[PDB]
Amino acid sequence: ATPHINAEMGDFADVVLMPGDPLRAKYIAETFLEDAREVNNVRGMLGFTGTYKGRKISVMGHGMGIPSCSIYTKELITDFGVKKIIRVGSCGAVLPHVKLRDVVIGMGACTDSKVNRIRFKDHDFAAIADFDMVRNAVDAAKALGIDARVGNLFSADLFYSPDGEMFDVMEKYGILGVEMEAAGIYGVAAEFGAKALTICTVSDHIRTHEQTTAAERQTTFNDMIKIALESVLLGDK
Amino acid sequence: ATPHINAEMGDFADVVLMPGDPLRAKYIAETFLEDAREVNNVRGMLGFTGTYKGRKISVMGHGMGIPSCSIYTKELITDFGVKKIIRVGSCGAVLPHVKLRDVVIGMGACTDSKVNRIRFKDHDFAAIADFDMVRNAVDAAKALGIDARVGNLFSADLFYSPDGEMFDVMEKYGILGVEMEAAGIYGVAAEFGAKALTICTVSDHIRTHEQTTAAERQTTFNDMIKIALESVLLGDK
Amino acid sequence: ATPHINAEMGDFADVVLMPGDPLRAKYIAETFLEDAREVNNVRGMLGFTGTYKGRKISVMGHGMGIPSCSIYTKELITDFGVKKIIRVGSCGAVLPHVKLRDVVIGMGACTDSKVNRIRFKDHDFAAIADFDMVRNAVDAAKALGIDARVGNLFSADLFYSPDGEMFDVMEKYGILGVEMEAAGIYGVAAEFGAKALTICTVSDHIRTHEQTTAAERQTTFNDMIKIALESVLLGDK
Amino acid sequence: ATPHINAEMGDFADVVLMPGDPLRAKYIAETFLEDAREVNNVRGMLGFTGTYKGRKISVMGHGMGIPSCSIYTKELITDFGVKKIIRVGSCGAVLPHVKLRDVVIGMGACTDSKVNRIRFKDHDFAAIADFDMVRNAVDAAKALGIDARVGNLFSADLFYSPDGEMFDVMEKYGILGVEMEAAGIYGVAAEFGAKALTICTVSDHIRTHEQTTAAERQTTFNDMIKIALESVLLGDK
Amino acid sequence: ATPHINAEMGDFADVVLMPGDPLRAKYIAETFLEDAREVNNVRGMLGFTGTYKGRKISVMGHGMGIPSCSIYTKELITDFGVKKIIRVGSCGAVLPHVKLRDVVIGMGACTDSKVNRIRFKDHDFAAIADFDMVRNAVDAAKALGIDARVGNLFSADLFYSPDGEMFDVMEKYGILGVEMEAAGIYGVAAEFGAKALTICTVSDHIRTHEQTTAAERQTTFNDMIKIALESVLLGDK
Amino acid sequence: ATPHINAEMGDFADVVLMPGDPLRAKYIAETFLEDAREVNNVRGMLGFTGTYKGRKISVMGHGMGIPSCSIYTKELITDFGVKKIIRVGSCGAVLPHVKLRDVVIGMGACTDSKVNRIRFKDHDFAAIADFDMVRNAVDAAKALGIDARVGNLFSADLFYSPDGEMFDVMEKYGILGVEMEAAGIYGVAAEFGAKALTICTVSDHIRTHEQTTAAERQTTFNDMIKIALESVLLGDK
Numbered sequence A, B, C, D, E, F: 001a002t003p004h005i006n007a008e009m010g011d012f013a014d015v016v017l018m019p020g021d022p023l024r025a026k027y028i029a030e031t032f033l034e035d036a037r038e039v040n041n042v043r044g045m046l047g048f049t050g051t052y053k054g055r056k057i058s059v060m061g062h063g064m065g066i067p068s069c070s071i072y073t074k075e076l077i078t079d080f081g082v083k084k085i086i087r088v089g090s091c092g093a094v095l096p097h098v099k100l101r102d103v104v105i106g107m108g109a110c111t112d113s114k115v116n117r118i119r120f121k122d123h124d125f126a127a128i129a130d131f132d133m134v135r136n137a138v139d140a141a142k143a144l145g146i147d148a149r150v151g152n153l154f155s156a157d158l159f160y161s162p163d164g165e166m167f168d169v170m171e172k173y174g175i176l177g178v179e180m181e182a183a184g185i186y187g188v189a190a191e192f193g194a195k196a197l198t199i200c201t202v203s204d205h206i207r208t209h210e211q212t213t214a215a216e217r218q219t220t221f222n223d224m225i226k227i228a229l230e231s232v233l234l235g236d237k
């Protein structure tokens, strides 16, 4: 077992899908996995294991923020033999040509955190995903008919930022969406030698919030998950 | 109803106790509060409100990490009329003469996070707790005949630090315990004008690696809740 | 005899009061201490030792600035057996509801200096005062029927700041007063294991530019000394 | 005509290859481009424009360092309508498994430079290449049966770094090759909305170097240019 | 008058010599000035005005540290019409080929303070003296027979440094001596448009402290002062 | 033979002039040096060695930017026994009184680069020229009846700075000219114990530029080289 995960070696697949919300991790195991079993529930951070089209897959929440997801991804990679981590979450839009319900894939992730400077002797560590995972994700989305955008994400430490003028900067350097974990997970993946990726759906538009209809918002979230799950099979081949 | 809290103005008391563990909030509600009802469950971040010796009080977890508890403490303060926040969590010991199960009262909190530098034009902001609350707790402890060291805590962004040499520095400066939220909570309290205090139970020792055990886990965590609840009454006097 | 203090082990009491003004130390020795003798005059940094209501106490200025008071507090602590240090100085007000002659008790001290970042591996060190001393003073004040706000001070390196916009930031965060030594003294106290507290008399207002006047200068500065001297006795009880 | 480029709008193609040595721009124009024509000579920075299998292509050296390549790539993007920039050159390996003559593609570029911090409000900007250009280069290499590795690069400001342990860090974080431009080129592209890529060949292994001949070394170089050239065409579809 | 200087326009010469110690400023007025009058004594920081070989000159202490000397030099330049400031003090040796009783002139001054970064938007401001003053000083020392060294000084914030390994760095980059004000005065001079210079005599050798004989040490301090005073006359011509 | 300089020890004189444009190294060798002989061609960085009035002198371009000039000046100092380095070039004025064609001598060089911070433990290193070389250049100019100004220069990493108010700061602190090498050359000299100087001519006034002819512009340039050349001889005594 582990300080934050009460399970044993074998309980998880070598691939773990991670939503920020635990209740959302249960929703995924319910909707897409066959024969899903709960493998952890410490602090209410639900984790499940099952199979998709015959492939052993796991899904577990990682909580909000870099400090939170860092603890979990680290314990999985170094104590449960996990090799891949695909974060499937939500992000806010900054660029105008980016619309609600757009699937974005973070090849890289900018940040206002200090975690990577701490690991990188205070220089700039470019937090990036695994190239193959990005490609698998891009090819799966195409098969499903979705036109995914691949670029930079911004991982913020303050959801309720004091500044706000930093949003002008993000849009200027082409940031595709803002969330809160990418840069942290990538930093962890680099540190312990595993592979990670982050896919997001635009939850709202910083510029002008607002959304469409629940039915459509939920269809796009499912499209994202199918791309995540399908990209894995694709990577097995 | 806020982005992460599904409740209406009135569901929460003007005073909230906050453990990182959602399940611990529930354990507290079931053991110390009377006629307590659940006011939140969004993202499983369970919140409760009942009464303690007549007084109305609430308890809700904040998850792990500064960015996590920042969101929660901020929404309660600006959309639910919360005036006091008392985090009740666990920490790691760095000093030899600091035992497991020990109770520490953070008058201040150091940190390796950037949230505060972003707020204070990159200068050093002394994240300190509210004085009266620090005193109410010190008294509540003396009345309960319980021990409690008052001092500096260290709010870390990385539970699994890549720089262990920083623990000597933490020790050299007498840091009582290592947790992950204090400096963030104290930062937000100041930003939105509120009062906060952090109380912690030494759950483990960083040098000796000794992790909690026996039924001395709960009980010790029962004194921490005792002191917090009682320190509120003194504050009401 | 240290590099900047010409005295021998024993000349100083275990408790020293320290104003920035050397002449003020002398005024204090002549008005509050009994059978006081001069123990230092190197660089004109006058030091005195006498008794107050039976207790042996010393008073010596520290000059202006963190680097200045750092030298002095460090030599007293390591070569004269000093255990407590209580700075008694003046500060500038930033908040509207903070009047001239007001007494502030620095529980913490923010800063734009680098001395602490150099000590804390470039992280945020919460420079806080010793808790019991903060309490002894708050009581000494209540007994004297004197008012005294307890909170954060701001230790500036530049009295004539080139960035006045930082005062809004200081205000926004409720900084009680602007002085130039607190964070340095609290830093040294921690480094060489000692206890310190800073008490200040609002000598001017940064917004209104109102500078002290009338015979209300001295007297107000007489309450500050009163509280300090008395807070020591309480601490002896 | 820009300050450093004496030529008119239309002289350069929408795509430009950039070697370090300006002498290399000539070799490429003569060894690979059809109907070539010099288009710049300022400061000796030789630049040509020709065609590769019907596709108009330009080639021009950029000098050593981020400050240099930054002015060139900027003027081209803002004053000659350049849409894509492919940098070709050499780098030093730090990983044991990365061998001399290995081809490396910088999907991302770390750096010890401050240019991006100055651009991104002193936060962490992830300098990444354009995903499609990356994928094109990989596919094109596969076509030529060459083995290309996709990862992080490190843009050092000092070819002679007074610091040595920094190479240990780079290794620990899987840096593929060390060079001096990628991070600067990526920041500019992001700044003025253009696409860029960096492809390198391991010239030296810093740690342990073998012995490459000028014969082998030109083959690898020509292999890199074919990869860069064929990738454009794929990019074209 | 001024907050720290109780004098009036006209009381000081347009040239001010400033030793760190006030008692030393009186020693200078006594030994080298004709018809010297005390023009300030606030906080015991003695200031004098008189003439040398018919030239009106002033001399006043500036206290220890950048925060201290910054307040005084600023008040003199902007409230008492001072145009030149020559700091005459003591410094510690770092380079072996630098011997006790060597007169060093700081053309520039490195620092561990954060004052200049605050004035210079966080970049590197090279704190330097006025070229003519450096030359006058160099020519005067020659007339007197002294062989002055002209180079860099290091202005420290912590006289009792936590590090100490920074001394290896200073010697490596050729620092001539370490004191505590130069960088601050130069920053002030640049900010308010006046001219400043710093001359120092090696008080000891960090490498191996120790000194010669009082008679010789005091002869060299007087040589320094004569160079300071003589350089002024030289500058008048 | 160094990585960037294909030549042997003895090929370069103890003194080397360095222009930005490598084409300029040729013009100087032919227009001013006797018995000139090319000594390097790598990457097109042309370098020559001849004599000026019996004095052996070398000339070679260094490229644009601190990262570039840093490798060249380093290899020369450590591998060809170069004792002094004089950089000659142009810069942009930011002060109103500094006119086009004005000659400027950088006694110091500010910068927005991180190279010196990386070298000096993240503290402020004052990048200064060698005082005697500075004085020689001034005297030599006077001889040629030219008006030279001695002050601070600013070494910008980005010729196209996204930040604009930074020019206001530079003006406020009396910066004389903006360029891109001085601070890097000075850091290297300090690092390997050598002497260096930078002399510039105002080419543009950034703010308001007039109209200089290629006729006038060459005269100023030749005036600068005579100053640089005559100063060496004075340096020789």
Ligand SMILES: Nc1ncnc2c1ncn2[C@@H]1O[C@H](CO)[C@@H](O)[C@H]1O
Binding pocket: A020, A064, A065, A089, A090, A091, A092, A156, A158, A159, A178, A179, A180, A181, A203, A206, B003
């Ligand atoms: N504009 C935004 N700023 C910060 N986090 C955001 C934003 N939009 C969506 N998120 C993400 O969604 C959650 C908060 O609602 C977090 O998990 C965070 O990653």
Ligand SMILES: Nc1ncnc2c1ncn2[C@@H]1O[C@H](CO)[C@@H](O)[C@H]1O
Binding pocket: B020, B063, B064, B065, B089, B090, B091, B092, B093, B156, B158, B159, B178, B179, B180, B181, B203, B204, B206
């Ligand atoms: N040794 C430790 N280091 C850091 N955080 C700790 C430690 N022990 C307990 N914690 C706390 O518990 C959680 C991490 O397990 C966080 O909420 C943090 O406050």
Ligand SMILES: Nc1ncnc2c1ncn2[C@@H]1O[C@H](CO)[C@@H](O)[C@H]1O
Binding pocket: C020, C063, C064, C065, C089, C090, C091, C092, C093, C156, C158, C159, C178, C179, C180, C181, C203, C204, C206
């Ligand atoms: N407005 C102010 N700003 C900064 N320091 C002040 C101010 N007013 C009083 N002080 C204090 O008095 C001295 C400067 O006059 C320092 O010792 C400092 O603590």
Ligand SMILES: Nc1ncnc2c1ncn2[C@@H]1O[C@H](CO)[C@@H](O)[C@H]1O
Binding pocket: D020, D063, D064, D065, D089, D090, D091, D092, D093, D156, D159, D178, D179, D180, D181, D203, D204, D206, F003, F004
């Ligand atoms: N080992 C290496 N370290 C740093 N830069 C290198 C190295 N090998 C090749 N280069 C590259 O070649 C040039 C320096 O010779 C620079 O343009 C740089 O990108």
Ligand SMILES: Nc1ncnc2c1ncn2[C@@H]1O[C@H](CO)[C@@H](O)[C@H]1O
Binding pocket: C003, E020, E064, E065, E089, E090, E091, E092, E156, E158, E159, E178, E179, E180, E181, E203, E206
């Ligand atoms: N080694 C040293 N470190 C710091 N300050 C020094 C040193 N040697 C001499 N000084 C100077 O002398 C005084 C302290 O004795 C201060 O004014 C300071 O400038």
Ligand SMILES: Nc1ncnc2c1ncn2[C@@H]1O[C@H](CO)[C@@H](O)[C@H]1O
Binding pocket: D003, D004, F020, F063, F064, F065, F089, F090, F091, F092, F093, F156, F159, F178, F179, F180, F181, F203, F204, F206
């Ligand atoms: N206005 C200017 N700004 C920045 N660098 C300049 C300027 N004018 C001339 N230069 C110099 O000339 C080159 C850029 O054209 C660089 O080597 C730089 O030193």
